[PDB]
């Protein structure tokens, strides 16, 4: 579920450079990468 | 004369380029710019 | 020794970059003026 959390990342300027990376909004990796949709699950439960 | 102008312009641009970035550390609360971090180091080094 | 050590240690830590860069700019401009004077002299005292 932690991976399903849509984390928001602010705009930061990396040290020792003039690059300012874009912020990330509602960054739910488990879902924004399609894994939630692909596997139909928000976690991993395995029974062998 | 032309190279004189170019070199002085390069130094002037380099000053701002060095001052541009920002700094963040886990042990030091907050995000520090170049001059703020330099000032903090000056004070701490001098007193210690 | 203490008085000099505090200042030199402060300088070594990149805490004087702006002033050093401006002084370097001034010195480079001085050297450029010297070069221009030498070129003008060489033009004046031709070897022909």
UniProtKB/Swiss-Prot annotation, chain B:
Induction: Up-regulated in response to enterovirus 71 (EV71) infection (at protein level).
Modification after translation (UniProt): Palmitoylated; structural requirement for proper assembly of the hydrophobic core of the lipoprotein particle.
Subcellular localization(s) per the UniProt record: Cytoplasm; Secreted; Lipid droplet
Function text: Apolipoprotein B is a major protein constituent of chylomicrons (apo B-48), LDL (apo B-100) and VLDL (apo B-100). Apo B-100 functions as a recognition signal for the cellular binding and internalization of LDL particles by the apoB/E receptor.
Illness the protein is tied to: Hypobetalipoproteinemia, familial, 1: A disorder of lipid metabolism characterized by less than 5th percentile age- and sex-specific levels of low density lipoproteins, and dietary fat malabsorption. Clinical presentation may vary from no symptoms to severe gastrointestinal and neurological dysfunction similar to abetalipoproteinemia. Hypercholesterolemia, familial, 2: A form of hypercholesterolemia, a disorder of lipoprotein metabolism characterized by elevated serum low-density lipoprotein (LDL) cholesterol levels, which result in excess deposition of cholesterol in tissues and leads to xanthelasma, xanthomas, accelerated atherosclerosis and increased risk of premature coronary heart disease. FHCL2 inheritance is autosomal dominant.
Complex formation: Interacts with PCSK9. Interacts with MTTP. Interacts with AUP1. Interacts with CIDEB.
Entry protein name: Apolipoprotein B-100
UniProt organism field: Homo sapiens (Human)
Taxonomic lineage: Eukaryota, Metazoa, Chordata, Craniata, Vertebrata
Portion held of the full protein: 4180 to 4227 of 4563
